Amino acid sequence: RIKKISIEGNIAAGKSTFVNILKQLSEDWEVVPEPVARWSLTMEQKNGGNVLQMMYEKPERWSFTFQTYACLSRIRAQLASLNGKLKDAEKPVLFFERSVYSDRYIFASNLYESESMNETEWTIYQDWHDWMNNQFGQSLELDGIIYLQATPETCLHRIYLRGRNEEQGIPLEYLEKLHYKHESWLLHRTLKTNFDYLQEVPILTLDVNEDFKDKYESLVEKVKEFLSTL
Amino acid sequence: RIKKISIEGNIAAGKSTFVNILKQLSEDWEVVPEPVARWSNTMEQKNGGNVLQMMYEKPERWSFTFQTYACLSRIRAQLASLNGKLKDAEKPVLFFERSVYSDRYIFASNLYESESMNETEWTIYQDWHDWMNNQFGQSLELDGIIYLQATPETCLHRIYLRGRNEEQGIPLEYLEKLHYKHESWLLHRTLKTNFDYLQEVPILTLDVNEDFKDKYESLVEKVKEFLSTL
Ligand SMILES: CCCc1sc(-c2ccc(OC)c(OCCNS(C)(=O)=O)c2)nc1CSc1nc(N)cc(N)n1
Ligand SMILES: CCCc1sc(-c2ccc(OC)c(OCCNS(C)(=O)=O)c2)nc1CSc1nc(N)cc(N)n1
Ligand SMILES: O=c1ccn([C@@H]2O[C@H](COP(=O)(O)OP(=O)(O)O)[C@@H](O)[C@H]2O)c(=O)[nH]1
Ligand SMILES: O=c1ccn([C@@H]2O[C@H](COP(=O)(O)OP(=O)(O)O)[C@@H](O)[C@H]2O)c(=O)[nH]1
């Protein structure tokens, strides 16, 4: 009976900011952080610690490997929040920091289109992704999507505006791709998929364009109004 | 209810011929051929030819991707049989051409030791393999193993007989290490895997150096006798 809601958005757009806020507003709300973030000392970390630097260091060698690991690690954290967090809340909501579809339809896709993965690497990844995401068939299935919307430029601010040694090289151009991949997926809804419920899940667009850090109340109101609809 | 037996042995031990021979003998007797062996000869088959072909040219680049895809293809292909085949035979037995256990502890373990997977790939694969098998491959658990123990030169000769222009190389030295790792897991029973039960799991081991595609009644008498103590 748990609602599962993915919060989408570009690098350093504020997804984690938002989910950190939402978690403390209700004791019936919990957050699943995205693993690549914790990567960015268990065996998942060193590995993702390793695979992330290796990806940065050379993407067209390491993208498949990185992509497959990011997603399995996501599929395992989300399974372990639903089966752990929140036992009998009246109104339980689980907020996911991104989803298995951002893994593929935004990130995996982009690397394929950036020629950082070949057709065999991309078809294999999809095969792996699609046969598996048809195994769980309604467990991880989303109830709603919330899209934090920044400009690649708002996002670019915040990437520097944000502290991680390794991230300092991310150039503007990486972002406009993901943005159009984001805008085209979650608004214009051109981008099609092989998950026969995703073209009917509803979406909440949210201008994180104005700083919303000590002025988060009306965003949170839209979220509450949205939840009531679902 | 459906009994699962793994057929294990070095490349060209004679697994595909023994298993083809066995399946003719009984309507209770069914088979799951190895995905890899099928690729040598459908998008999976489109993917499978290419990465195998890639894995010959540059094992050091392609072993993670090959080992992940080989194992994924076996699981799903063992599941399809398990979910459908033998629903009611009276005494159903499915013979697997190799297993997720050889995927990992012969071929991947060897690929890494010989430095075609670096350390991180091998740890990721091992993590992938634990979770992929626990979530999806559970009901594939083995009732026993038929280890078709042979020797190196036999196989080279048999590779030649088959005429497979890709393998006709394979260093007698590479046939010689794959050969050595099967003893440890199966012959001496030393290798403790990550899956505890196998330690108990009954193993039959047959010497098959001699041409058998005419004479195997003794090979089959020991199967039948093995299967009944199960
Ligand atoms: C934000 C830290 C993760 C990284 S690192 C990275 C990267 C690093 C170096 C790259 O090339 C030099 C690269 O892309 C190749 C070309 N793009 S570029 C930098 O404009 O020339 C991507 N992409 C990414 C995003 S891939 C990703 N996949 C997921 N499945 C989830 C997720 N959160 N992120
Ligand atoms: C028989 C077709 C599959 C191949 S191709 C292959 C290969 C091909 C070319 C190679 O070098 C040019 C090669 O070398 C591997 C490393 N060389 S070495 C002597 O160990 O240092 C391996 N190994 C293999 C076996 S790995 C494997 N894993 C599975 N899980 C299943 C399966 N059938 N095979
Ligand atoms: O309204 C906002 C949104 C984001 N940020 C900053 O932007 C950076 C990146 O945010 P986050 O890591 O939460 O973004 P995500 O990558 O999760 O979209 C962080 O330093 C945040 O403090 C901010 O100061 N105010
Ligand atoms: O007793 C035998 C078993 C096999 N073969 C031949 O050796 C080759 C390799 O055998 P197989 O495909 O069974 O090996 P595996 O499937 O174990 O790789 C094939 O062309 C077989 O016809 C043979 O001549 N005598």
Coordinates of C-alpha atoms and ligand atoms in Angstrom, one line a residue:
Chain A
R1 CA 0.0 0.0 0.0
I2 CA 3.1 2.2 -0.1
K3 CA 3.2 5.0 -2.7
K4 CA 6.5 5.0 -4.5
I5 CA 7.5 8.3 -6.0
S6 CA 10.6 9.1 -8.0
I7 CA 12.1 12.6 -7.9
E8 CA 14.0 13.3 -11.2
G9 CA 16.5 16.0 -12.3
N10 CA 19.9 17.1 -13.6
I11 CA 23.2 16.8 -11.7
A12 CA 23.3 19.2 -8.8
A13 CA 19.7 20.4 -9.5
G14 CA 18.8 19.8 -5.8
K15 CA 17.1 16.4 -5.8
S16 CA 18.9 15.4 -2.6
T17 CA 18.2 18.9 -1.2
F18 CA 14.5 18.3 -1.7
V19 CA 14.4 14.7 -0.5
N20 CA 16.3 15.7 2.7
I21 CA 13.6 18.3 3.4
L22 CA 10.7 16.0 2.6
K23 CA 11.9 13.3 4.9
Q24 CA 11.6 15.5 8.0
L25 CA 8.2 17.0 7.3
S26 CA 6.4 13.7 7.9
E27 CA 7.3 10.6 9.9
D28 CA 5.3 8.8 7.2
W29 CA 7.8 9.9 4.5
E30 CA 11.1 8.2 3.9
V31 CA 13.9 8.7 1.3
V32 CA 16.0 6.3 -0.8
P33 CA 19.2 8.1 -1.8
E34 CA 20.6 7.1 -5.2
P35 CA 23.7 4.9 -4.9
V36 CA 26.0 6.8 -7.3
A37 CA 25.7 9.6 -4.8
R38 CA 27.1 7.6 -1.8
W39 CA 29.7 6.4 -4.3
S40 CA 30.5 10.1 -5.2
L41 CA 33.3 1.4 3.7
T42 CA 31.2 -1.5 2.3
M43 CA 31.9 -3.5 -0.8
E44 CA 29.4 -1.5 -2.9
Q45 CA 31.3 1.8 -2.2
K46 CA 34.9 0.8 -3.0
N47 CA 33.6 -0.8 -6.2
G48 CA 31.4 2.1 -7.0
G49 CA 34.2 4.3 -5.6
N50 CA 36.4 2.5 -8.1
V51 CA 34.0 2.3 -11.0
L52 CA 33.1 6.0 -10.7
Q53 CA 36.7 7.3 -11.0
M54 CA 37.4 4.8 -13.8
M55 CA 34.3 6.0 -15.6
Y56 CA 35.4 9.7 -15.2
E57 CA 38.9 8.7 -16.2
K58 CA 37.7 6.9 -19.3
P59 CA 33.9 6.6 -20.2
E60 CA 33.9 4.5 -23.4
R61 CA 35.8 1.7 -21.6
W62 CA 33.7 1.8 -18.4
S63 CA 30.1 3.0 -19.2
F64 CA 28.4 -0.4 -19.6
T65 CA 30.0 -1.7 -16.4
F66 CA 29.2 1.5 -14.5
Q67 CA 25.6 1.6 -15.8
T68 CA 24.9 -2.1 -14.9
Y69 CA 26.4 -1.5 -11.4
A70 CA 24.5 1.8 -10.8
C71 CA 21.2 0.1 -11.6
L72 CA 21.6 -3.2 -9.7
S73 CA 22.8 -1.1 -6.7
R74 CA 19.6 1.0 -7.2
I75 CA 17.4 -2.0 -7.5
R76 CA 18.9 -3.4 -4.2
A77 CA 18.6 -0.2 -2.2
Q78 CA 15.0 0.4 -3.2
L79 CA 14.1 -3.3 -2.5
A80 CA 15.7 -2.8 0.9
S81 CA 13.8 0.4 1.8
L82 CA 10.4 -1.1 1.0
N83 CA 11.1 -4.2 3.0
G84 CA 12.6 -2.3 5.9
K85 CA 11.4 1.3 6.3
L86 CA 7.9 2.5 7.3
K87 CA 6.2 -0.6 8.7
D88 CA 2.4 0.2 9.1
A89 CA 2.3 3.9 8.4
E90 CA -1.3 4.9 7.7
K91 CA -0.2 6.9 4.7
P92 CA 3.3 5.6 3.7
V93 CA 5.1 7.3 0.9
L94 CA 8.6 6.3 -0.3
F95 CA 10.6 8.9 -2.2
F96 CA 13.2 7.5 -4.6
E97 CA 16.1 9.8 -5.6
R98 CA 15.8 9.0 -9.3
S99 CA 14.6 5.7 -10.8
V100 CA 15.5 2.6 -13.0
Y101 CA 14.2 4.5 -15.9
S102 CA 16.6 7.5 -15.4
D103 CA 19.3 4.9 -15.3
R104 CA 18.4 3.7 -18.8
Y105 CA 16.2 6.3 -20.7
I106 CA 18.4 9.2 -19.6
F107 CA 21.8 8.1 -18.6
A108 CA 22.4 4.8 -20.3
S109 CA 20.7 6.2 -23.5
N110 CA 22.9 9.4 -23.4
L111 CA 26.1 7.3 -23.2
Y112 CA 24.9 5.2 -26.2
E113 CA 24.2 8.5 -28.1
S114 CA 27.5 9.9 -26.9
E115 CA 29.1 6.9 -28.5
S116 CA 30.5 5.9 -25.1
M117 CA 28.8 2.5 -25.6
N118 CA 28.4 0.5 -28.9
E119 CA 25.2 -1.2 -30.1
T120 CA 26.1 -4.6 -28.5
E121 CA 26.8 -2.9 -25.2
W122 CA 23.5 -0.9 -25.4
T123 CA 21.3 -3.9 -26.6
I124 CA 22.9 -6.1 -23.9
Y125 CA 22.2 -3.5 -21.3
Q126 CA 18.6 -3.1 -22.4
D127 CA 18.1 -6.9 -22.5
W128 CA 19.5 -7.2 -18.9
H129 CA 17.3 -4.1 -17.9
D130 CA 14.1 -5.1 -19.6
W131 CA 13.9 -8.9 -18.7
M132 CA 14.6 -8.0 -15.1
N133 CA 12.3 -5.0 -14.8
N134 CA 9.7 -7.5 -16.0
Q135 CA 10.5 -9.9 -13.2
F136 CA 9.3 -7.7 -10.3
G137 CA 6.2 -6.5 -12.3
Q138 CA 4.6 -4.0 -9.8
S139 CA 6.9 -3.9 -6.8
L140 CA 9.2 -1.1 -7.8
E141 CA 6.5 0.3 -10.2
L142 CA 6.1 4.0 -9.7
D143 CA 3.0 5.8 -8.3
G144 CA 4.2 9.2 -9.4
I145 CA 7.1 11.2 -10.7
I146 CA 8.2 14.6 -9.5
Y147 CA 10.6 16.5 -11.8
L148 CA 12.8 19.2 -10.2
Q149 CA 13.4 21.5 -13.1
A150 CA 16.6 23.5 -13.4
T151 CA 18.4 25.1 -16.4
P152 CA 21.6 23.3 -17.3
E153 CA 22.8 26.8 -16.2
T154 CA 21.0 26.8 -12.8
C155 CA 22.4 23.2 -12.6
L156 CA 25.9 24.4 -13.7
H157 CA 25.9 27.1 -10.9
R158 CA 25.0 24.4 -8.4
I159 CA 27.7 21.9 -9.5
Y160 CA 30.4 24.5 -8.7
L161 CA 28.1 25.9 -6.0
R162 CA 28.5 22.2 -4.6
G163 CA 31.6 20.5 -3.1
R164 CA 33.1 17.4 -4.7
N165 CA 36.7 17.4 -6.0
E166 CA 36.1 15.0 -8.9
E167 CA 32.9 16.8 -10.3
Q168 CA 34.7 20.1 -11.1
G169 CA 35.4 19.0 -14.7
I170 CA 31.8 18.6 -15.7
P171 CA 31.4 21.1 -18.6
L172 CA 28.2 22.9 -19.6
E173 CA 27.5 20.7 -22.6
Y174 CA 27.0 17.5 -20.7
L175 CA 23.9 19.1 -19.1
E176 CA 21.9 20.3 -22.1
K177 CA 21.8 16.8 -23.4
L178 CA 20.5 15.4 -20.1
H179 CA 18.1 18.3 -19.9
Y180 CA 16.6 17.7 -23.3
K181 CA 16.6 14.0 -22.4
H182 CA 14.9 15.1 -19.2
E183 CA 12.5 17.6 -20.8
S184 CA 11.6 15.3 -23.7
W185 CA 10.9 12.4 -21.2
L186 CA 9.0 14.2 -18.5
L187 CA 7.1 17.0 -20.2
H188 CA 7.0 16.8 -24.0
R189 CA 6.7 13.0 -23.3
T190 CA 8.2 12.1 -26.8
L191 CA 10.7 9.5 -25.4
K192 CA 8.9 6.1 -25.5
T193 CA 9.6 2.9 -23.4
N194 CA 8.8 -0.8 -22.9
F195 CA 7.1 -0.6 -19.6
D196 CA 3.3 -0.6 -20.1
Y197 CA 2.3 1.7 -17.2
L198 CA 4.9 4.5 -17.6
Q199 CA 3.0 6.4 -20.3
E200 CA 0.1 6.7 -17.8
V201 CA 2.0 7.6 -14.5
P202 CA 1.4 11.2 -13.6
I203 CA 4.2 13.8 -13.4
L204 CA 4.7 16.9 -11.1
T205 CA 7.0 19.5 -12.6
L206 CA 8.7 21.8 -10.1
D207 CA 10.8 24.9 -10.7
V208 CA 13.8 24.4 -8.5
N209 CA 15.0 27.3 -10.6
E210 CA 14.4 29.7 -7.8
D211 CA 16.4 28.7 -4.7
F212 CA 13.9 26.8 -2.6
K213 CA 16.0 26.1 0.5
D214 CA 14.4 28.4 3.1
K215 CA 11.4 29.0 0.9
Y216 CA 10.4 25.4 0.3
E217 CA 6.7 25.6 1.5
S218 CA 4.7 26.0 -1.8
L219 CA 6.7 23.2 -3.6
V220 CA 5.9 21.0 -0.7
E221 CA 2.3 22.0 -1.0
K222 CA 2.3 21.0 -4.7
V223 CA 3.7 17.6 -3.6
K224 CA 1.0 17.2 -1.0
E225 CA -1.7 18.1 -3.5
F226 CA -0.2 15.8 -6.0
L227 CA -0.1 12.9 -3.5
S228 CA -3.8 13.3 -2.8
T229 CA -4.6 12.8 -6.5
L230 CA -2.7 9.6 -6.9
Chain B
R1 CA 9.4 -31.7 -8.3
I2 CA 11.5 -31.3 -11.5
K3 CA 15.0 -32.6 -10.7
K4 CA 18.0 -30.4 -11.7
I5 CA 21.3 -32.1 -12.8
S6 CA 24.3 -30.1 -14.0
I7 CA 26.6 -31.6 -16.7
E8 CA 30.1 -30.1 -16.0
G9 CA 33.4 -30.5 -17.8
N10 CA 36.3 -28.9 -19.8
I11 CA 35.6 -27.4 -23.3
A12 CA 34.9 -30.4 -25.6
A13 CA 34.8 -32.9 -22.7
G14 CA 31.7 -34.2 -24.7
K15 CA 28.8 -32.4 -22.8
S16 CA 26.6 -31.6 -25.8
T17 CA 26.8 -35.2 -27.2
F18 CA 26.2 -37.0 -23.9
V19 CA 23.3 -34.6 -23.1
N20 CA 21.8 -35.0 -26.7
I21 CA 22.2 -38.8 -26.1
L22 CA 20.5 -38.8 -22.7
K23 CA 17.4 -36.8 -23.8
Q24 CA 16.6 -39.4 -26.4
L25 CA 16.3 -42.1 -23.7
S26 CA 13.3 -40.8 -21.8
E27 CA 10.2 -38.5 -21.7
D28 CA 11.0 -37.8 -18.1
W29 CA 14.3 -36.5 -19.4
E30 CA 14.8 -32.9 -20.6
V31 CA 17.7 -30.6 -21.3
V32 CA 18.9 -26.9 -21.2
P33 CA 21.7 -26.3 -23.6
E34 CA 24.5 -23.8 -22.9
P35 CA 23.8 -20.3 -24.3
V36 CA 27.4 -19.9 -25.1
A37 CA 27.6 -23.2 -27.1
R38 CA 24.5 -22.0 -29.0
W39 CA 26.2 -18.6 -29.9
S40 CA 29.0 -20.6 -31.7
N41 CA 26.5 -22.3 -34.1
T42 CA 16.9 -13.5 -32.3
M43 CA 18.4 -10.4 -30.6
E44 CA 20.0 -12.4 -27.8
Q45 CA 21.7 -14.5 -30.5
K46 CA 22.5 -11.3 -32.3
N47 CA 24.1 -9.9 -29.1
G48 CA 25.7 -13.3 -28.3
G49 CA 27.6 -13.8 -31.6
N50 CA 29.2 -10.3 -31.4
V51 CA 30.4 -10.3 -27.8
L52 CA 31.8 -13.8 -28.2
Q53 CA 33.5 -12.6 -31.3
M54 CA 34.7 -9.5 -29.3
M55 CA 35.9 -11.7 -26.5
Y56 CA 38.2 -13.6 -28.8
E57 CA 39.8 -10.5 -30.1
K58 CA 40.4 -8.7 -26.7
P59 CA 39.6 -10.9 -23.7
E60 CA 40.9 -8.2 -21.5
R61 CA 38.3 -5.6 -22.6
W62 CA 35.3 -7.9 -23.0
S63 CA 35.3 -10.5 -20.2
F64 CA 33.1 -8.6 -17.7
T65 CA 30.5 -8.0 -20.4
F66 CA 30.7 -11.6 -21.7
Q67 CA 30.6 -13.2 -18.3
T68 CA 27.6 -11.1 -17.2
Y69 CA 25.6 -11.8 -20.4
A70 CA 26.5 -15.6 -20.6
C71 CA 25.2 -16.0 -17.0
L72 CA 22.1 -13.8 -17.5
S73 CA 21.2 -15.9 -20.6
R74 CA 21.7 -19.2 -18.8
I75 CA 19.5 -18.2 -15.8
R76 CA 16.6 -17.1 -18.0
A77 CA 17.0 -20.2 -20.2
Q78 CA 17.0 -22.5 -17.2
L79 CA 14.0 -20.7 -15.8
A80 CA 11.9 -21.0 -19.0
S81 CA 12.5 -24.9 -18.9
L82 CA 11.8 -25.1 -15.2
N83 CA 8.6 -23.1 -15.5
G84 CA 7.2 -25.1 -18.4
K85 CA 8.9 -28.4 -19.3
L86 CA 8.0 -31.7 -17.5
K87 CA 4.9 -30.3 -15.7
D88 CA 3.8 -33.9 -15.5
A89 CA 6.2 -36.5 -16.6
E90 CA 6.2 -39.1 -13.9
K91 CA 9.8 -38.7 -12.9
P92 CA 11.0 -35.4 -14.5
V93 CA 14.7 -34.7 -14.8
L94 CA 16.3 -31.6 -16.4
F95 CA 19.9 -31.8 -17.4
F96 CA 21.6 -28.4 -17.5
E97 CA 24.6 -27.9 -19.8
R98 CA 26.8 -26.4 -17.2
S99 CA 25.5 -24.1 -14.5
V100 CA 25.7 -20.6 -12.9
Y101 CA 28.4 -22.3 -10.8
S102 CA 30.8 -23.0 -13.6
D103 CA 30.0 -19.6 -15.1
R104 CA 31.5 -18.1 -12.0
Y105 CA 34.1 -20.6 -10.6
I106 CA 35.6 -22.0 -13.8
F107 CA 35.3 -19.4 -16.5
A108 CA 35.1 -16.0 -14.6
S109 CA 37.6 -17.0 -11.8
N110 CA 40.0 -18.1 -14.6
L111 CA 39.4 -14.9 -16.7
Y112 CA 40.3 -12.7 -13.8
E113 CA 43.3 -14.8 -12.6
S114 CA 44.7 -14.5 -16.1
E115 CA 44.0 -10.7 -15.9
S116 CA 41.3 -10.3 -18.5
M117 CA 39.1 -8.9 -15.7
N118 CA 40.7 -6.4 -13.4
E119 CA 40.0 -6.6 -9.7
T120 CA 36.9 -4.3 -9.7
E121 CA 35.1 -6.1 -12.5
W122 CA 35.6 -9.4 -10.8
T123 CA 34.2 -8.0 -7.5
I124 CA 31.2 -6.4 -9.2
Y125 CA 30.5 -9.6 -11.1
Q126 CA 30.7 -11.6 -7.9
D127 CA 28.3 -9.1 -6.3
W128 CA 26.1 -9.3 -9.4
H129 CA 26.2 -13.1 -9.3
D130 CA 25.1 -13.3 -5.6
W131 CA 22.1 -11.1 -6.2
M132 CA 21.1 -12.2 -9.6
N133 CA 21.0 -15.8 -8.4
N134 CA 19.3 -15.1 -5.0
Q135 CA 16.4 -13.0 -6.5
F136 CA 15.8 -14.8 -9.8
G137 CA 17.7 -18.1 -9.8
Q138 CA 16.6 -19.6 -6.5
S139 CA 14.5 -22.5 -7.9
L140 CA 17.4 -23.5 -10.2
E141 CA 19.3 -25.0 -7.2
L142 CA 21.0 -28.3 -8.1
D143 CA 20.0 -31.8 -7.0
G144 CA 23.4 -33.1 -8.2
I145 CA 26.2 -32.9 -10.6
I146 CA 27.5 -35.1 -13.4
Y147 CA 31.2 -34.2 -13.9
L148 CA 32.5 -35.4 -17.3
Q149 CA 36.2 -35.6 -16.5
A150 CA 38.5 -36.1 -19.5
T151 CA 41.9 -34.8 -20.7
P152 CA 43.3 -31.8 -22.6
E153 CA 44.5 -33.3 -25.9
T154 CA 41.2 -35.1 -26.4
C155 CA 39.4 -31.7 -26.4
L156 CA 41.9 -30.1 -28.8
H157 CA 41.3 -33.1 -31.2
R158 CA 37.5 -32.7 -30.5
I159 CA 37.6 -28.9 -31.2
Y160 CA 39.3 -29.8 -34.5
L161 CA 36.7 -32.5 -35.3
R162 CA 33.9 -29.9 -34.7
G163 CA 35.8 -27.6 -37.1
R164 CA 35.1 -24.4 -35.1
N165 CA 37.3 -21.9 -36.7
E166 CA 37.3 -19.5 -33.6
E167 CA 38.4 -22.2 -31.1
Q168 CA 40.9 -24.3 -33.2
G169 CA 43.4 -22.0 -31.5
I170 CA 42.6 -22.1 -27.8
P171 CA 46.0 -22.8 -26.3
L172 CA 46.4 -26.4 -25.1
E173 CA 47.7 -24.4 -22.1
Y174 CA 44.3 -22.6 -21.8
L175 CA 42.6 -26.0 -22.3
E176 CA 45.1 -27.1 -19.6
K177 CA 44.0 -24.5 -16.9
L178 CA 40.2 -24.9 -17.4
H179 CA 41.0 -28.6 -17.0
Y180 CA 42.8 -27.9 -13.6
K181 CA 40.0 -25.8 -11.9
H182 CA 37.3 -28.5 -12.4
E183 CA 39.3 -31.0 -10.3
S184 CA 39.4 -28.7 -7.3
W185 CA 35.7 -27.8 -7.3
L186 CA 34.6 -31.3 -8.3
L187 CA 37.3 -34.0 -8.3
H188 CA 39.1 -33.2 -4.9
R189 CA 36.0 -31.4 -3.6
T190 CA 38.1 -28.6 -2.0
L191 CA 36.6 -25.3 -3.5
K192 CA 34.1 -23.9 -1.1
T193 CA 31.8 -21.6 -3.1
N194 CA 29.5 -18.9 -1.8
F195 CA 26.6 -21.3 -1.9
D196 CA 26.9 -23.7 1.1
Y197 CA 24.5 -26.5 0.0
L198 CA 26.7 -27.7 -2.9
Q199 CA 29.3 -29.0 -0.3
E200 CA 26.6 -31.6 0.5
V201 CA 25.4 -31.9 -3.1
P202 CA 26.1 -35.4 -4.5
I203 CA 28.4 -35.6 -7.4
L204 CA 29.0 -38.3 -10.0
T205 CA 32.1 -38.3 -11.9
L206 CA 32.7 -40.2 -15.1
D207 CA 35.9 -40.7 -17.1
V208 CA 35.0 -40.0 -20.8
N209 CA 38.3 -39.8 -22.9
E210 CA 37.1 -42.7 -25.1
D211 CA 34.7 -42.2 -28.1
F212 CA 31.2 -42.9 -26.8
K213 CA 28.7 -41.7 -29.4
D214 CA 28.3 -45.5 -30.1
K215 CA 29.0 -47.0 -26.8
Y216 CA 27.6 -45.4 -23.6
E217 CA 25.4 -47.9 -22.0
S218 CA 27.8 -48.0 -19.1
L219 CA 27.9 -44.2 -19.0
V220 CA 24.0 -44.2 -18.8
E221 CA 23.7 -47.1 -16.3
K222 CA 25.6 -44.9 -13.8
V223 CA 23.5 -41.9 -14.5
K224 CA 20.3 -43.9 -13.9
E225 CA 21.8 -45.4 -10.7
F226 CA 22.9 -41.9 -9.6
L227 CA 19.5 -40.4 -10.3
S228 CA 17.7 -43.0 -8.2
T229 CA 19.9 -42.3 -5.1
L230 CA 18.5 -38.8 -5.4
Ligands
LIG1 C1 27.5 12.6 -11.6 C2 28.6 11.4 -11.4 C3 28.3 10.3 -12.4 C4 28.9 10.5 -13.8 S1 30.4 10.7 -14.2 C5 30.2 10.9 -15.9 C6 31.0 11.1 -16.9 C7 32.4 11.3 -16.8 C8 33.2 11.6 -17.9 C9 32.7 11.6 -19.1 O1 33.4 11.9 -20.2 C10 34.7 12.6 -20.0 C11 31.3 11.4 -19.3 O2 30.7 11.5 -20.5 C12 31.3 11.4 -21.8 C13 31.1 12.7 -22.7 N1 30.3 13.7 -22.0 S2 31.3 15.3 -21.8 C14 31.9 15.4 -20.1 O3 30.4 16.5 -22.1 O4 32.5 15.3 -22.8 C15 30.5 11.2 -18.2 N2 28.9 10.8 -16.1 C16 28.2 10.6 -14.9 C17 26.6 10.5 -15.0 S3 26.1 8.8 -15.4 C18 24.9 8.3 -14.2 N3 24.3 7.1 -14.5 C19 23.4 6.6 -13.7 N4 22.9 5.4 -14.0 C20 23.0 7.3 -12.6 C21 23.6 8.5 -12.3 N5 23.3 9.2 -11.3 N6 24.5 9.0 -13.1
LIG2 C1 34.3 -21.3 -25.8 C2 33.9 -19.9 -26.1 C3 34.0 -18.9 -24.9 C4 35.5 -18.4 -24.7 S1 36.4 -17.5 -25.7 C5 37.7 -17.4 -24.7 C6 38.8 -16.8 -25.1 C7 39.1 -16.4 -26.4 C8 40.3 -15.8 -26.7 C9 41.2 -15.6 -25.8 O1 42.5 -15.1 -26.0 C10 42.6 -14.5 -27.3 C11 41.0 -16.0 -24.5 O2 42.0 -15.8 -23.6 C12 41.6 -15.7 -22.2 C13 42.9 -15.3 -21.4 N1 44.1 -16.0 -22.0 S2 45.0 -16.9 -20.8 C14 45.8 -18.3 -21.5 O3 44.0 -17.5 -19.8 O4 46.0 -16.0 -20.1 C15 39.8 -16.7 -24.1 N2 37.4 -18.1 -23.6 C16 36.2 -18.6 -23.6 C17 35.6 -19.4 -22.3 S3 34.9 -18.4 -21.0 C18 33.2 -19.0 -20.8 N3 32.5 -18.6 -19.7 C19 31.2 -19.2 -19.5 N4 30.5 -18.8 -18.5 C20 30.7 -20.1 -20.4 C21 31.5 -20.4 -21.5 N5 31.1 -21.3 -22.4 N6 32.7 -19.9 -21.6
LIG3 O1 17.5 25.3 -3.9 C1 18.7 24.9 -3.9 C2 19.0 23.7 -4.7 C3 20.3 23.3 -4.7 N1 21.3 23.9 -4.0 C4 22.7 23.4 -4.0 O2 23.1 22.8 -5.2 C5 24.0 21.8 -4.9 C6 23.6 20.5 -5.5 O3 22.4 20.0 -5.0 P1 22.0 18.5 -4.8 O4 23.3 17.7 -4.5 O5 21.0 18.3 -3.8 O6 21.4 18.2 -6.3 P2 21.1 16.9 -7.1 O7 22.3 16.4 -7.8 O8 20.7 16.0 -6.0 O9 20.0 17.3 -8.1 C7 24.1 21.7 -3.4 O10 25.3 22.3 -2.9 C8 22.9 22.4 -2.9 O11 23.1 22.9 -1.6 C9 21.0 25.0 -3.2 O12 21.9 25.6 -2.6 N2 19.7 25.5 -3.2
LIG4 O1 32.7 -39.5 -27.8 C1 32.8 -38.5 -28.5 C2 32.2 -37.3 -28.1 C3 32.3 -36.2 -28.9 N1 32.9 -36.3 -30.1 C4 32.9 -35.1 -31.0 O2 33.8 -34.1 -30.5 C5 33.3 -32.8 -30.7 C6 33.1 -32.0 -29.4 O3 32.1 -32.7 -28.5 P1 30.9 -31.9 -27.8 O4 30.3 -30.9 -28.7 O5 30.0 -32.9 -27.1 O6 31.7 -31.1 -26.6 P2 31.2 -30.0 -25.6 O7 29.7 -29.9 -26.0 O8 31.5 -30.6 -24.2 O9 31.8 -28.7 -25.8 C7 31.9 -33.0 -31.4 O10 32.0 -32.6 -32.8 C8 31.6 -34.5 -31.2 O11 30.9 -35.1 -32.3 C9 33.4 -37.5 -30.6 O12 34.0 -37.6 -31.7 N2 33.4 -38.6 -29.8

